[model samples]
Target: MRLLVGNDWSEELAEPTGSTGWAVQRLVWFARDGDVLVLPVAPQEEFLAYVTSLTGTRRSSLTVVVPPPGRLGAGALTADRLADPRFLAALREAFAGRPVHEVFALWPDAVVADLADALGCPEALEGHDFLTQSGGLIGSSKAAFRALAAGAGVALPAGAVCADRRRAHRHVTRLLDEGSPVILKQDYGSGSDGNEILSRTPGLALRGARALRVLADSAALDAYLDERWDWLTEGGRHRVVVERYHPGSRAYFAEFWISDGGVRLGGHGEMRYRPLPDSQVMPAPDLDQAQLDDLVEGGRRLCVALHALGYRGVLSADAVVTPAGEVLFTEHNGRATGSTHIYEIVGKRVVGPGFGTDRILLERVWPEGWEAPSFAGALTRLRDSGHLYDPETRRGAVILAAYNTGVMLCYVAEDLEAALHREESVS
Candidate 1:
């Protein structure tokens, strides 16, 4: 099948974790040889020429589509650029002969569907259930997830969703007065860019806290509210939620794939608070069958409900274990997450079914200005050191995504310490 992969990370579905360069890397797992991959910004020629030589045995028939030549270099291609008439027409020209059979994107949306429709192909996800989940009815809304968990009789920390800045300000004030550390989140657009933790005293952290200086000073709360409110409101995501931040030793994710036939337990992974997500360890660690069972059961039921409601494809459910060892289910992601492809593409394949293998793929970004005018020079240094990922041995550093705006990597190791050691070696 000819696959037309759209690494379209629209703002509506997720955060601007990075540029579209990283998008195609994770989606590589979803593809087979010969599939066509679409990239937002065309890669610099030197990187492309050198990359094909470095990849041992990954995708073979993989064609690439990128922003029209001459428009090359680092940075991101805006959503409008991807949806423009000329761009759409160019997409047509790029795939003149072959009939594209399968279509996919980071999130199912009007743009993706529009492109897919123009190509006369079936989207990887569609319908009311997927669309609702995409549009904030289910997976998209934290407030809605809280409600879903509540309806399922799941225990959740005391929380409130404030539709406007005034209410959100009042809610945070109340939560602080109650002596509880509160977590404020944006309603949509991926939580990584939007999560903020707050507490009463200056520098009060339950486990680990990330707070603005203004949050520590009660008086500065006004200054924060005034400034933060204006930015978020104007940013187009004013709907805010405040929840009792629990002191958890760790967080967990149990992913599931729902089809018309049934729901399958995909696997388990770990989570982080600050930055929305940190690193994902596949097949999860330290959890017994019962814990896994409970998480999957909750996720399965949610998936079944979604499937009945009209969703198909993949959705991962989130939960966390408190310091007290109690598991509290958080939210269900209607679409795939940052780590979804990590496991399906690379992690699971390396970790082994019994998880006898150990490795970690850090889905992170390079600091700004780290981007040089060219990638060939740096990549040549990396390749010469024999650090780039080698499919033959299946170890070392792999450039998962590239672009001036965002770059991501995956590190492989024999076990956990090696994973750490290798992670250290990358710099």
Candidate 2:
């Protein structure tokens, strides 16, 4: 059966972390079969017209892998339903001539059942095995991490707590008074959007409280917690847990793919904090085989635990290595992350001779061979260029991170330094 991937790349989901809108364009070129079609949502069209166009094709058998909609990217679509019947009906009509399968959703069974009832399609579609393997509000919870960490004998920090606004406000105040910086994150947030760093000093008190209070007011947070409560109340109730935010200067992501037989295969990559003085694009020299072994075992334990709970697809965990060389689990990403594409690019390079992977290399760029121009001219030039790049090679990528404010590009180079040099020279 041919696979059709649907990606929504409208402005509503515009953000740095929403790179999937761009990444999907690249992925469609590689992942699509000849019979497969990639459909991106257009703001002007209604669902019926959109899907009706897709049905014009004569393909008989098909599978539609629907990625999450909106600007926050994939994992953010963890909600129970899309909530738009017109959109759903349009999708059904688009694949009207074929059998469609859904993948890449947190809860495929519920979605499939809902879609089947809505579209009058029989439940003949294959349900995703991985979603069935995880439990507890789309497989994200402090209890989930605690159980996984315990099985691996990993000591998670103790101060972690999940709280409402009043509780978070009070707790953050106390933590700030302790004279140490703390990290405040949304229980279900993406990117670093809802996260903030608070210092222990008095000046940071208001900032810390304000950040927490803002997140507590967020509709996304409320929706997420409501689902978590519903899931937990079905059996047992557990609060979101918080731990002492580790004081690490960098972040690393580990993506693990576990087989049904219990074998784990994965890779790790590092993220550089912006405005840091050290080499921004270099991989972690501190990572060693022992750590990899530990990470593998840890991943296995987490996957097995998740599988037992009913989640089976790709699982990734984020961790921070303290200056003292202690690794702490920061959060668990139950779906694919932006780092996945970086991994793919780096992996391809490593498999070839004279190639290496680089972490986040922060740099500014202008047109080729031009000194960094005045802000006004840069804006004018980008407007004229229209952000187009070579489609065949998918190189010379340009992405507008902030609309009408700034842009960033990913250039492929033979060496890491060369990549940085290209960025600098353009700037």
Candidate 3:
């Protein structure tokens, strides 16, 4: 049985903690009959029931373990809690008779190495020496990604990794002089969370990019760097990556699974950002066979580099297909992403092997200003509207979460038009 750790690895990143409660539910995807899932928050019974009913995972067969009441509060799992004697004892009891074949975590760390040892399954750890040396942090760093991508001959934007604030200012000035807006990225922030765009043009269109810091001249660049250096550099500890921002570029990503065997594409999708990465469309639209091959090949090269460094598990490589037909790679996330569960549950289980070809999936935050429903109420509404997923037909919609912000809805159909129609029916 596989032991799955549902910790949101981004907790250790420069980005602040987000909806980990919603995140923990993703571990339910790909859960087998005898697996043990360790989460920081308690599982939602209603959500679990609905998911397992269609996914063929028995709700009672799997074991869900959460931290003590006061331990996790509203955060992701950490090393201290994973190493706690009480927690370890509980895990032992959960797997009393079963042997753990492998230990998988949302991200790798020394704690995982220690946990594997404590479970008496040292070989279960994905990469023991790599985890001990903090390979996850290395593999996920934006600056590190640039170096690795450059070495692998992947196409990149005009960018450089700045070691300090002085170098950062120089790079930003250089990019601005080249007549393109500049984007500054934190070394370890996920998605667009740790990015800031600088431009000479006022009222700059963000599309999906983060905060805009206007720069009038060289003096303004110095002032901006002086004021925001600490935040960008994580108090002068981490480096900052500065690149020329491209407008009108369509953002897309290909997620790969790195194993002892090799790296392989899990799935690819288009990213929709409402300032934050808020939604995704699977089997990324509008790409011909040649474009698709180039995209996956770039991602494969990066994943191969990471795998050689002994990092394993899922890593999503993000890039943009410029309107001019050029594909410039951006960054690769060396951890489980928002779309990981969608591919595993919807692509693998619900839609089968012909997922992208036979079925298209859309996962998005519930539409703004729409009335959110209780979990049970949402189910009734979908069933009544003939939009709920049917096992026989293998199509329709599923409400993934009912967060305070809004519900997360997943839609699937044989075509994108019909999938959106199904999604709009409930909206």
Candidate 4:
């Protein structure tokens, strides 16, 4: 079948750098059949005009993979909107003259489906099921996250109720009364954007309240409440939970792929650190089978629940592991993650012909002096240098993550020790 893989980004199309550029180049080289198109972020009419001029035919079954607009720009669609069928029909109508049979959204299918319907495209494959099934719900609503964490037996801070902007002052006052040194987080966000930490000193209380008031006033709280309250409310009452913030804990990311047969495919580990200097160091990596067995079981349960609700693909879970050895669920992604490159690298390196379970390193950079060859050169160097582990026959190292100016290499090692050695030596 002739497949067309298109990336709808102006920067990716114009500048040949980073993961997007690398993906474009890789697909062009590896795709033996079908033509690949990279569309720039331009006017909708421009995109349609270009497609009409290039295809030369109508009613062709084409698959267009675009990044989720939510993660990229305001122009992109939001997650909640993509679930509607009418949205897809509108998308098809917008590009009615083009031979676009199917549109597969790589980032957020829900949003894309909404866009598709709006444009009159009724047959777009959002790939949302893939996200809900494979990508964990860590980044969903805070209440949903709290439920998952509570299910996992992880301890979190005690939170308060705030249904609307009017409750901001009361919520902040309650937090202040509880004593300082706490965190105020939006019930629906990732990273550290919608979160603020209150100091233990009483002097910081008013400031904290004022800051929270700003968030509440600016509609942050309302947005989160609207999105998460349905899931948070145990018996139709809106509430937000809070708990003591753990100090000196590290952030960890774990990912696993589950099949239709209920088999959970174990993936590798990743260590995450923020650019901020004072950020905590988290030990994020491939969870032990025992640890994962429970998570896998939980994931299976969630999948079954979601499947019953008509959700299906990849699921990932994020957590904060205390130095004392406690794993607390932080949030869920429910979509494609930053660690996907690590999976691709591990599949090629550790897992050979057949795919099952294996651990691979997803280091951001090689050590300072280590020379990274071109993609082909890196593979050749590994083979010639006899660095390939006999156990991993088809396993070869590859570069997955790249910056705007440089590429990061993904190498396969026999174990953590070997991986560390390579990392240190390469530097």
The candidate scoring highest on lDDT is 3
* Model 1 stretches with alpha carbons more than 4 Å out: 7-25, 44-60, 67-98, 122-125, 128-138, 164-178, 206-238, 258-262, 272-278, 349-393, 403-407
Model 4 ranges with Cα > 4 A deviation: 1-104, 114-140, 147-157, 160-181, 187-190, 201-243, 256-268, 274-290, 348-359, 365-397
lDDT of 2 by residue, 155-266 (tens): 4554555545445445555564565556655444444543555453333323211242223223544553454433322223334443455554356556665434453545
Per-residue CA lDDT of model 3 for 361-405, tens digit only, reads: 888776777775567777877888888887678788866653443
lDDT of each: 0.59, 0.42, 0.80, 0.41
Among the numbered candidates, top TM-score falls to 3
Candidates in order, TM-scores: namely: 0.75, 0.57, 0.94, 0.54
Candidate 1 structure quality by residue, lDDT tens digits, 232-310: 4536555676777775457788887766577777767766544434455555667777777776777776667666666
Off by over 4 Å in 3: 10-20, 70-74, 274-276, 402-406
What is the C-alpha local distance difference test score of candidate 3?
Answer: 0.80
Model 4 TM-score relative to the real fold: 0.54
Deviation of model 1 at 94, angstroms: 4.9
lDDT of 4 by residue, 113-176 (tens): 4344444543444343443343323335566666655655554445543554346435654554
Ranking by lDDT: 3, 1, 2, 4
